[PDB]
Amino acid sequence: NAPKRPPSAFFLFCSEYRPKIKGEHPGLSIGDVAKKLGEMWNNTAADDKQPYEKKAAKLKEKYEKDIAAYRAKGKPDAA
């Protein structure tokens, strides 16, 4: 009832880290564990983003068509 957004590319790399840095650095918040790894992501190689990225893309793409359809006549009161 409204296709929302999926991953970013970072999103995958991020999930994978969330615990790992939050445990190693238990002095961060969800905005620090995210800020730190966010930077990492930016400088994770790029060739190390691609693997994750491809997923984020595939899903955002799906969404965009599922919403395009949602509105097309997908909705609870559309069918």
Side-chain angles (χ1 to χ4, degrees):
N1 300 64
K4 299 177 65 286
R5 302 183 63 118
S8 301
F10 166 0
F11 189 106
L12 304 315
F13 172 75
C14 96
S15 300
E16 178 178 290
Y17 282 25
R18 176 184 60 115
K20 183 180 178 62
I21 37 167
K22 184 181 296 183
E24 293 289 294
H25 311 287
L28 306 189
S29 305
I30 188 59
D32 293 301
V33 174
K35 171 176 179 180
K36 183 179 181 179
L37 120 78
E39 295 165 64
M40 299 291 99
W41 167 251
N42 296 309
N43 346 294
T44 188
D47 303 70
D48 185 69
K49 289 183 176 174
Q50 214 68 187
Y52 297 121
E53 196 183 67
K54 183 179 180 180
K55 305 186 182 66
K58 183 179 180 180
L59 305 186
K60 185 185 181 300
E61 182 183 64
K62 180 180 178 180
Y63 153 34
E64 301 279 293
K65 281 73 183 179
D66 281 54
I67 170 51
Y70 180 61
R71 299 187 303 238
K73 182 181 179 61
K75 287 172 63 286
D77 301 70

Coordinates of all heavy atoms in Angstrom, one line a residue:
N1 N 0.9 -1.2 0.0 CA 0.0 0.0 0.0 C 0.9 1.2 0.0 O 0.8 2.1 0.9 CB -0.9 -0.1 1.3 CG -1.8 -1.3 1.2 OD1 -1.3 -2.4 1.2 ND2 -3.1 -1.2 1.1
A2 N 1.7 1.3 -1.0 CA 2.8 2.3 -1.3 C 4.2 1.7 -1.2 O 4.7 1.7 -0.1 CB 2.7 3.5 -0.3
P3 N 4.7 1.2 -2.3 CA 6.1 0.8 -2.4 C 7.0 2.0 -1.9 O 7.0 3.1 -2.4 CB 6.2 0.5 -3.9 CG 4.8 -0.1 -4.2 CD 3.9 0.9 -3.5
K4 N 7.7 1.6 -0.9 CA 8.7 2.5 -0.2 C 10.1 2.4 -0.9 O 10.1 1.8 -2.0 CB 8.8 2.2 1.3 CG 7.4 2.3 1.9 CD 7.4 1.9 3.4 CE 8.3 2.8 4.3 NZ 9.7 2.6 4.1
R5 N 11.1 2.8 -0.2 CA 12.5 2.7 -0.8 C 13.2 1.5 -0.2 O 13.0 1.2 1.0 CB 13.3 4.0 -0.5 CG 12.5 5.2 -1.1 CD 13.4 6.5 -0.9 NE 14.6 6.3 -1.6 CZ 15.0 7.1 -2.6 NH1 14.4 7.0 -3.8 NH2 15.8 8.1 -2.4
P6 N 14.1 0.9 -1.0 CA 15.0 -0.2 -0.5 C 16.4 0.4 -0.2 O 16.6 1.6 -0.2 CB 15.0 -1.1 -1.7 CG 15.0 -0.2 -2.9 CD 14.2 1.1 -2.5
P7 N 17.4 -0.4 0.1 CA 18.9 -0.1 0.1 C 19.4 1.1 -0.7 O 18.7 1.6 -1.6 CB 19.6 -1.4 -0.2 CG 18.4 -2.4 -0.5 CD 17.3 -1.9 0.4
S8 N 20.6 1.5 -0.4 CA 21.4 2.6 -1.1 C 22.6 2.1 -1.9 O 23.0 2.7 -2.9 CB 21.8 3.6 0.0 OG 20.5 4.0 0.5
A9 N 23.2 1.1 -1.3 CA 24.4 0.4 -1.8 C 25.2 0.3 -0.5 O 25.6 -0.8 -0.1 CB 25.3 1.3 -2.8
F10 N 25.3 1.4 0.1 CA 25.9 1.6 1.4 C 25.1 0.7 2.3 O 25.6 -0.1 3.0 CB 25.8 3.1 1.8 CG 26.1 3.6 3.3 CD1 26.4 2.7 4.3 CD2 25.9 4.9 3.6 CE1 26.7 3.1 5.5 CE2 26.1 5.3 4.9 CZ 26.5 4.4 5.9
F11 N 23.8 0.8 2.3 CA 22.8 0.0 3.1 C 23.3 -1.5 3.4 O 23.2 -1.9 4.5 CB 21.5 0.0 2.3 CG 20.4 -0.7 3.2 CD1 19.4 0.1 3.8 CD2 20.4 -2.0 3.4 CE1 18.4 -0.4 4.6 CE2 19.4 -2.6 4.2 CZ 18.4 -1.8 4.8
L12 N 23.8 -2.1 2.4 CA 24.3 -3.5 2.6 C 25.6 -3.5 3.4 O 25.6 -4.0 4.5 CB 24.7 -4.2 1.2 CG 23.5 -4.2 0.1 CD1 22.2 -4.6 0.7 CD2 23.3 -2.8 -0.6
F13 N 26.6 -2.8 2.9 CA 27.9 -2.6 3.6 C 27.6 -2.2 5.1 O 28.3 -2.7 6.0 CB 28.6 -1.6 2.8 CG 30.0 -1.1 3.4 CD1 31.1 -1.9 3.4 CD2 30.0 0.2 4.0 CE1 32.3 -1.4 4.0 CE2 31.2 0.6 4.5 CZ 32.3 -0.2 4.5
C14 N 26.7 -1.4 5.2 CA 26.2 -0.8 6.5 C 25.7 -1.9 7.4 O 26.2 -2.1 8.5 CB 25.1 0.3 6.4 SG 23.4 -0.2 6.5
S15 N 24.7 -2.6 7.0 CA 24.1 -3.8 7.8 C 25.3 -4.7 8.3 O 25.3 -5.0 9.5 CB 23.2 -4.6 6.9 OG 22.2 -3.7 6.5
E16 N 26.1 -5.0 7.4 CA 27.3 -5.9 7.7 C 28.2 -5.4 8.8 O 28.8 -6.1 9.5 CB 28.0 -6.0 6.3 CG 29.3 -6.9 6.5 CD 30.0 -7.0 5.1 OE1 29.4 -7.7 4.3 OE2 31.0 -6.4 4.9
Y17 N 28.2 -4.1 8.9 CA 29.0 -3.4 9.9 C 28.3 -3.0 11.2 O 28.9 -3.1 12.3 CB 29.6 -2.1 9.3 CG 30.8 -2.3 8.4 CD1 31.0 -3.5 7.8 CD2 31.7 -1.3 8.3 CE1 32.2 -3.7 7.0 CE2 32.8 -1.4 7.5 CZ 33.0 -2.6 6.8 OH 34.2 -2.8 6.0
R18 N 27.1 -2.5 11.1 CA 26.3 -2.0 12.2 C 26.7 -2.6 13.6 O 27.2 -1.9 14.4 CB 24.8 -2.3 11.8 CG 23.9 -2.0 13.0 CD 22.4 -2.4 12.7 NE 22.4 -3.9 12.4 CZ 21.7 -4.7 13.2 NH1 20.5 -4.9 13.0 NH2 22.4 -5.2 14.2
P19 N 26.6 -3.9 13.7 CA 27.1 -4.6 15.0 C 28.6 -4.4 15.2 O 29.1 -3.8 16.1 CB 26.7 -6.1 14.8 CG 26.7 -6.2 13.3 CD 26.0 -4.9 12.8
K20 N 29.4 -5.0 14.2 CA 30.9 -4.9 14.2 C 31.6 -3.6 14.7 O 32.6 -3.7 15.4 CB 31.3 -5.2 12.8 CG 32.9 -5.2 12.7 CD 33.3 -5.5 11.2 CE 34.8 -5.5 11.1 NZ 35.4 -6.6 11.9
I21 N 31.0 -2.5 14.4 CA 31.7 -1.2 14.8 C 31.0 -0.6 16.1 O 31.6 0.1 16.8 CB 31.6 -0.2 13.6 CG1 30.3 -0.3 12.9 CG2 32.8 -0.5 12.7 CD1 30.1 0.9 11.9
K22 N 29.8 -1.0 16.2 CA 28.9 -0.6 17.4 C 29.4 -1.4 18.6 O 29.3 -1.0 19.7 CB 27.5 -1.0 17.0 CG 26.5 -0.5 18.1 CD 25.1 -0.9 17.7 CE 24.7 -0.1 16.4 NZ 23.2 -0.5 16.0
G23 N 30.0 -2.5 18.4 CA 30.6 -3.4 19.4 C 32.0 -3.0 19.7 O 32.4 -3.0 20.9
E24 N 32.8 -2.7 18.7 CA 34.2 -2.3 18.8 C 34.3 -0.9 19.3 O 35.2 -0.5 20.0 CB 34.8 -2.4 17.4 CG 34.9 -3.9 17.0 CD 36.0 -4.7 17.9 OE1 37.1 -4.3 17.8 OE2 35.5 -5.5 18.7
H25 N 33.3 -0.1 18.9 CA 33.2 1.3 19.3 C 31.8 1.5 20.0 O 30.9 2.1 19.4 CB 33.4 2.2 18.1 CG 34.6 1.7 17.3 ND1 35.8 1.9 17.7 CD2 34.7 1.0 16.2 CE1 36.6 1.3 16.8 NE2 36.0 0.7 15.9
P26 N 31.6 1.0 21.2 CA 30.4 1.2 22.0 C 30.2 2.6 22.6 O 29.7 2.7 23.7 CB 30.5 0.0 23.0 CG 32.0 0.0 23.3 CD 32.6 0.2 21.9
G27 N 30.7 3.5 21.9 CA 30.7 5.0 22.3 C 30.0 5.8 21.1 O 30.1 7.0 21.2
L28 N 29.4 5.1 20.2 CA 28.8 5.7 19.0 C 27.2 5.5 19.1 O 26.8 4.6 19.9 CB 29.3 5.0 17.7 CG 30.8 5.0 17.6 CD1 31.2 4.5 16.2 CD2 31.4 6.4 17.8
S29 N 26.5 6.3 18.4 CA 25.0 6.2 18.3 C 24.7 5.8 16.9 O 25.6 5.5 16.1 CB 24.5 7.6 18.5 OG 25.0 8.1 19.8
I30 N 23.5 5.6 16.6 CA 23.0 5.1 15.2 C 23.4 6.1 14.1 O 23.3 5.8 13.0 CB 21.5 4.9 15.3 CG1 21.0 4.2 14.0 CG2 20.8 6.2 15.5 CD1 21.7 2.8 13.8
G31 N 23.8 7.3 14.6 CA 24.2 8.4 13.6 C 25.8 8.5 13.6 O 26.3 9.3 12.8
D32 N 26.4 7.7 14.4 CA 27.9 7.8 14.5 C 28.4 6.5 13.8 O 29.3 6.5 13.0 CB 28.3 7.8 15.9 CG 27.9 9.1 16.6 OD1 28.4 10.1 16.1 OD2 27.2 9.1 17.6
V33 N 27.7 5.4 14.2 CA 28.0 4.1 13.6 C 27.7 4.1 12.1 O 28.3 3.5 11.3 CB 27.1 3.0 14.3 CG1 27.3 1.6 13.7 CG2 27.5 2.9 15.8
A34 N 26.8 5.0 11.8 CA 26.4 5.2 10.4 C 27.3 6.3 9.8 O 27.6 6.1 8.6 CB 24.9 5.7 10.5
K35 N 27.6 7.3 10.5 CA 28.5 8.3 10.0 C 29.9 7.8 9.6 O 30.5 8.0 8.6 CB 28.6 9.5 11.0 CG 29.7 10.5 10.6 CD 29.7 11.7 11.6 CE 30.8 12.7 11.1 NZ 30.8 13.8 12.1
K36 N 30.5 7.0 10.6 CA 31.8 6.4 10.4 C 31.8 5.4 9.3 O 32.5 5.6 8.3 CB 32.1 5.7 11.7 CG 33.5 5.1 11.7 CD 33.8 4.4 13.1 CE 35.3 3.8 13.0 NZ 35.6 3.2 14.3
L37 N 31.0 4.4 9.3 CA 30.9 3.5 8.2 C 30.5 4.2 7.0 O 30.9 3.8 5.9 CB 30.0 2.4 8.8 CG 28.7 2.1 8.0 CD1 29.1 1.3 6.7 CD2 27.7 1.3 8.9
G38 N 29.7 5.2 7.1 CA 29.2 5.9 5.8 C 30.5 6.4 5.1 O 30.7 6.2 3.9
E39 N 31.4 7.0 5.8 CA 32.7 7.5 5.2 C 33.4 6.3 4.6 O 33.8 6.3 3.4 CB 33.6 8.0 6.3 CG 32.9 9.3 6.9 CD 33.5 9.7 8.3 OE1 34.7 10.0 8.2 OE2 32.8 9.6 9.2
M40 N 33.6 5.2 5.4 CA 34.2 4.0 4.9 C 33.7 3.6 3.5 O 34.4 3.4 2.6 CB 34.0 2.9 5.9 CG 34.5 3.2 7.3 SD 36.3 3.3 7.5 CE 36.6 5.1 7.3
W41 N 32.4 3.5 3.5 CA 31.6 3.1 2.3 C 32.1 4.0 1.1 O 32.5 3.5 0.1 CB 30.1 3.4 2.5 CG 29.4 3.3 1.2 CD1 28.9 4.4 0.6 CD2 29.2 2.2 0.5 NE1 28.4 3.9 -0.5 CE2 28.5 2.6 -0.7 CE3 29.6 0.9 0.7 CZ2 28.2 1.6 -1.6 CZ3 29.2 -0.1 -0.2 CH2 28.5 0.3 -1.4
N42 N 32.1 5.3 1.4 CA 32.5 6.2 0.3 C 33.9 5.8 -0.2 O 34.2 5.8 -1.4 CB 32.6 7.7 0.8 CG 31.1 8.1 1.2 OD1 30.2 8.0 0.4 ND2 30.9 8.6 2.4
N43 N 34.8 5.5 0.7 CA 36.2 5.1 0.4 C 36.3 3.6 0.7 O 37.3 3.2 1.4 CB 37.2 5.9 1.3 CG 36.5 7.1 1.9 OD1 36.0 8.1 1.2 ND2 36.3 7.2 3.2
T44 N 35.4 2.7 0.2 CA 35.6 1.3 0.5 C 36.3 0.5 -0.7 O 36.5 -0.6 -0.7 CB 34.1 0.7 0.7 OG1 34.3 -0.7 1.1 CG2 33.3 0.6 -0.6
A45 N 36.6 1.3 -1.7 CA 37.3 0.9 -3.0 C 36.5 1.5 -4.2 O 37.1 2.1 -5.1 CB 37.4 -0.6 -3.2
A46 N 35.2 1.2 -4.2 CA 34.3 1.5 -5.3 C 34.0 0.2 -6.0 O 32.9 -0.2 -6.3 CB 34.9 2.5 -6.4
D47 N 35.1 -0.5 -6.1 CA 35.0 -1.9 -6.7 C 34.6 -2.9 -5.6 O 34.3 -4.0 -5.9 CB 36.5 -2.3 -7.2 CG 37.0 -1.2 -8.2 OD1 37.3 -0.1 -7.7 OD2 37.1 -1.6 -9.3
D48 N 34.4 -2.3 -4.5 CA 33.9 -3.1 -3.3 C 32.5 -2.6 -3.0 O 31.8 -3.2 -2.1 CB 34.8 -2.8 -2.1 CG 34.4 -3.7 -0.9 OD1 34.6 -4.9 -1.0 OD2 33.9 -3.2 0.1
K49 N 32.1 -1.6 -3.7 CA 30.8 -1.0 -3.5 C 29.9 -1.8 -4.5 O 28.9 -2.4 -4.1 CB 30.6 0.5 -3.9 CG 31.3 1.4 -3.0 CD 31.1 2.9 -3.5 CE 31.7 3.9 -2.6 NZ 31.5 5.3 -3.2
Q50 N 30.3 -1.8 -5.7 CA 29.7 -2.5 -6.8 C 28.9 -3.8 -6.4 O 27.7 -3.8 -6.7 CB 30.8 -2.9 -7.9 CG 30.2 -2.9 -9.3 CD 29.8 -1.4 -9.7 OE1 29.2 -1.2 -10.7 NE2 30.2 -0.4 -9.0
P51 N 29.5 -4.7 -5.7 CA 28.8 -6.0 -5.2 C 27.5 -5.7 -4.5 O 26.5 -6.3 -4.7 CB 29.9 -6.7 -4.4 CG 30.9 -5.5 -4.0 CD 30.9 -4.8 -5.4
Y52 N 27.6 -4.7 -3.6 CA 26.4 -4.3 -2.7 C 25.5 -3.4 -3.5 O 24.3 -3.6 -3.6 CB 27.0 -3.5 -1.6 CG 27.9 -4.3 -0.6 CD1 29.2 -3.9 -0.4 CD2 27.4 -5.5 0.0 CE1 30.0 -4.7 0.4 CE2 28.2 -6.2 0.8 CZ 29.6 -5.8 1.0 OH 30.4 -6.5 1.8
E53 N 26.1 -2.5 -4.2 CA 25.4 -1.5 -5.0 C 24.4 -2.2 -6.0 O 23.3 -1.8 -6.0 CB 26.6 -0.8 -5.8 CG 26.0 0.5 -6.4 CD 27.1 1.2 -7.2 OE1 27.5 0.6 -8.2 OE2 27.6 2.2 -6.8
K54 N 24.9 -3.1 -6.7 CA 24.1 -3.9 -7.7 C 22.7 -4.3 -7.1 O 21.7 -4.2 -7.7 CB 24.9 -5.1 -8.2 CG 24.1 -5.9 -9.2 CD 24.9 -7.1 -9.7 CE 24.1 -7.9 -10.7 NZ 24.9 -9.1 -11.2
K55 N 22.8 -4.6 -5.8 CA 21.6 -5.1 -5.1 C 20.7 -3.8 -4.9 O 19.6 -3.8 -5.4 CB 21.9 -5.7 -3.7 CG 22.9 -6.8 -3.8 CD 23.1 -7.5 -2.4 CE 24.2 -8.6 -2.5 NZ 25.5 -8.0 -2.8
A56 N 21.2 -2.9 -4.2 CA 20.4 -1.6 -4.0 C 19.7 -1.1 -5.2 O 18.6 -0.9 -5.2 CB 21.4 -0.5 -3.5
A57 N 20.5 -1.1 -6.3 CA 20.0 -0.7 -7.6 C 18.8 -1.6 -8.0 O 17.7 -1.1 -8.1 CB 21.1 -0.8 -8.7
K58 N 19.0 -2.9 -8.2 CA 18.0 -3.9 -8.6 C 16.7 -3.6 -7.8 O 15.6 -3.6 -8.4 CB 18.6 -5.3 -8.3 CG 17.5 -6.4 -8.7 CD 18.1 -7.7 -8.4 CE 17.1 -8.8 -8.9 NZ 17.7 -10.2 -8.6
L59 N 16.8 -3.4 -6.5 CA 15.6 -3.2 -5.7 C 15.0 -1.8 -5.9 O 13.8 -1.8 -6.2 CB 16.0 -3.4 -4.2 CG 16.7 -4.8 -4.1 CD1 17.0 -5.0 -2.6 CD2 15.9 -5.9 -4.7
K60 N 15.7 -0.8 -5.9 CA 15.1 0.6 -6.1 C 14.3 0.5 -7.5 O 13.2 0.9 -7.6 CB 16.2 1.7 -6.3 CG 15.5 3.0 -6.4 CD 16.5 4.2 -6.6 CE 15.7 5.5 -6.7 NZ 14.7 5.5 -7.9
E61 N 15.0 -0.1 -8.4 CA 14.4 -0.3 -9.8 C 13.1 -1.0 -9.6 O 12.1 -0.5 -10.0 CB 15.4 -1.2 -10.6 CG 14.9 -1.4 -12.0 CD 15.9 -2.3 -12.8 OE1 16.0 -3.4 -12.4 OE2 16.5 -1.8 -13.7
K62 N 13.1 -2.2 -9.0 CA 11.8 -3.0 -8.8 C 10.7 -2.0 -8.2 O 9.6 -1.9 -8.7 CB 12.1 -4.1 -7.8 CG 10.8 -4.9 -7.6 CD 11.0 -6.1 -6.6 CE 9.7 -6.8 -6.4 NZ 9.9 -8.0 -5.5
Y63 N 11.1 -1.4 -7.1 CA 10.2 -0.4 -6.4 C 9.5 0.5 -7.4 O 8.3 0.5 -7.6 CB 11.1 0.3 -5.4 CG 10.5 1.7 -5.0 CD1 9.2 2.0 -5.0 CD2 11.5 2.7 -4.7 CE1 8.8 3.3 -4.6 CE2 11.0 4.0 -4.4 CZ 9.7 4.3 -4.4 OH 9.3 5.6 -4.0
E64 N 10.3 1.3 -8.1 CA 9.9 2.2 -9.1 C 8.9 1.7 -10.1 O 8.0 2.5 -10.6 CB 11.1 2.7 -9.9 CG 12.1 3.3 -8.9 CD 11.8 4.8 -8.5 OE1 11.9 5.6 -9.5 OE2 11.4 5.0 -7.4
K65 N 8.9 0.4 -10.3 CA 7.9 -0.2 -11.3 C 6.7 -0.7 -10.6 O 5.6 -0.7 -11.1 CB 8.6 -1.4 -12.0 CG 9.5 -0.9 -13.2 CD 10.8 -0.3 -12.7 CE 11.6 0.2 -13.8 NZ 12.9 0.8 -13.4
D66 N 6.9 -1.0 -9.3 CA 5.9 -1.5 -8.4 C 5.0 -0.4 -8.0 O 3.9 -0.6 -7.6 CB 6.5 -2.2 -7.2 CG 7.0 -3.6 -7.6 OD1 7.7 -3.8 -8.6 OD2 6.6 -4.5 -6.9
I67 N 5.6 0.8 -8.0 CA 4.9 2.0 -7.6 C 4.2 2.5 -8.8 O 3.0 2.9 -8.8 CB 5.9 3.0 -7.0 CG1 5.2 4.4 -6.8 CG2 7.0 3.3 -7.9 CD1 4.0 4.2 -5.9
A68 N 4.9 2.5 -9.9 CA 4.4 2.9 -11.2 C 3.1 2.1 -11.5 O 2.2 2.5 -12.1 CB 5.4 2.7 -12.3
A69 N 3.2 0.9 -10.9 CA 2.0 -0.1 -11.1 C 1.0 0.2 -10.0 O -0.2 0.2 -10.2 CB 2.6 -1.5 -11.0
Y70 N 1.6 0.4 -8.8 CA 0.7 0.7 -7.6 C -0.3 1.8 -7.9 O -1.5 1.6 -7.6 CB 1.6 1.2 -6.5 CG 0.8 1.5 -5.2 CD1 0.1 0.6 -4.5 CD2 0.9 2.8 -4.7 CE1 -0.6 0.9 -3.4 CE2 0.2 3.1 -3.5 CZ -0.6 2.2 -2.9 OH -1.3 2.5 -1.7
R71 N 0.2 2.8 -8.6 CA -0.7 3.9 -9.0 C -1.4 3.5 -10.3 O -2.5 3.9 -10.5 CB 0.3 5.1 -9.3 CG 1.0 5.5 -7.9 CD 1.7 6.8 -8.1 NE 2.7 6.7 -9.2 CZ 4.0 6.8 -9.0 NH1 4.4 7.7 -8.1 NH2 4.9 6.2 -9.7
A72 N -0.7 2.8 -11.2 CA -1.3 2.4 -12.5 C -2.7 1.9 -12.3 O -3.6 2.2 -13.1 CB -0.5 1.2 -13.1
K73 N -2.9 1.1 -11.2 CA -4.1 0.5 -10.7 C -3.7 -0.8 -10.0 O -3.9 -1.9 -10.4 CB -5.1 0.1 -11.9 CG -6.4 -0.5 -11.3 CD -7.3 -0.9 -12.5 CE -8.6 -1.5 -12.1 NZ -9.4 -0.6 -11.2
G74 N -3.0 -0.5 -8.9 CA -2.4 -1.6 -8.0 C -3.2 -1.6 -6.6 O -3.6 -2.6 -6.2
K75 N -3.2 -0.4 -6.1 CA -3.8 0.0 -4.8 C -4.9 -1.0 -4.2 O -5.6 -1.7 -5.0 CB -4.5 1.4 -4.9 CG -3.4 2.5 -4.9 CD -4.0 3.9 -5.2 CE -4.9 4.3 -4.1 NZ -6.2 3.6 -4.2
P76 N -5.1 -1.0 -2.9 CA -6.2 -1.7 -2.2 C -7.6 -1.5 -2.8 O -8.4 -2.4 -2.8 CB -6.1 -1.2 -0.7 CG -5.4 0.1 -0.9 CD -4.3 -0.2 -1.9
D77 N -7.8 -0.3 -3.4 CA -9.1 0.0 -4.0 C -8.9 0.2 -5.6 O -9.5 1.0 -6.2 CB -9.6 1.3 -3.4 CG -9.8 1.1 -1.9 OD1 -8.8 1.0 -1.2 OD2 -10.9 1.1 -1.5
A78 N -8.0 -0.6 -6.1 CA -7.7 -0.6 -7.5 C -7.8 -2.1 -8.1 O -8.5 -2.3 -9.0 CB -6.3 -0.1 -7.7
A79 N -7.1 -2.9 -7.4 CA -6.9 -4.4 -7.6 C -5.5 -4.7 -8.1 O -4.8 -3.8 -8.5 CB -7.9 -4.9 -8.7

